[PDB]
């Protein structure tokens, strides 16, 4: 189920990054490593990393 | 003359990235490209890109 939500537009520049649109639903299985999250984007079905401060926890 | 200030810690994972600490003063000369800024970090003297929402504009 959805763990996080994207809060800022993120356009990948690098080959391991996950594209985000504001309010995109995210599934984060693991703890952040060195201020990056690894996520499955539930709108786009893509997987990848994004910066720690671009998503919040959902309740 | 400083144009922006970092408000969140940004730990590079990629070779072209700029390391930010909270409060670093930044010189942004160029237009953002796909919501990344290119900057000179006035604390460290380092250059590179970081995601646009990690900094505020200073007047």
Numbering used by the authors:
A (entry chain BBB), B (entry chain AAA): 490 to 548
Sentences copied from the publication:
Aromatic residues cluster in the core of folded proteins, where they stabilize the structure through multiple interactions. NMR studies in the 1970s demonstrated that aromatic side chains can undergo ring flips—that is, 180° rotations of the χ2 dihedral angle (Cβ–Cγ axis)—even when engaged in stabilizing interactions in the hydrophobic core. Here we capture ring flipping events of a buried tyrosine residue in the SH3 domain of the JNK-interacting protein 1 (JIP1).
Accordingly, we designed four different mutants of JIP1-SH3 (H493A, V517A, V517L and A541L) and obtained their high-resolution structures by X-ray crystallography. Of note, three mutants (H493A, V517A and A541L) induce a staggered conformation of Y526, with χ2 dihedral angles ranging from −41° to −75°, whereas V517L shows an eclipsed conformation of Y526 and an almost identical structure to the wild-type protein. The A541L mutation also triggers a staggered conformation of Y526 and a rearrangement of the 517–522 region; however, the stabilization mechanism of the aromatic ring is different. A looping out of the β-strand between residues 517 and 522 is observed, which allows the side chain of A521 to reorient and to stabilize the staggered conformation of the ring through CH–π interactions together with L541 and V517. At the same time, the side chains of L519, Q520 and E522 and D523 undergo large-scale movements to accommodate the flipped ring within the pocket. The initial generation of void volume around the ring is almost identical along the structural trajectory between the major state (wild type) and the A541L crystal structure.
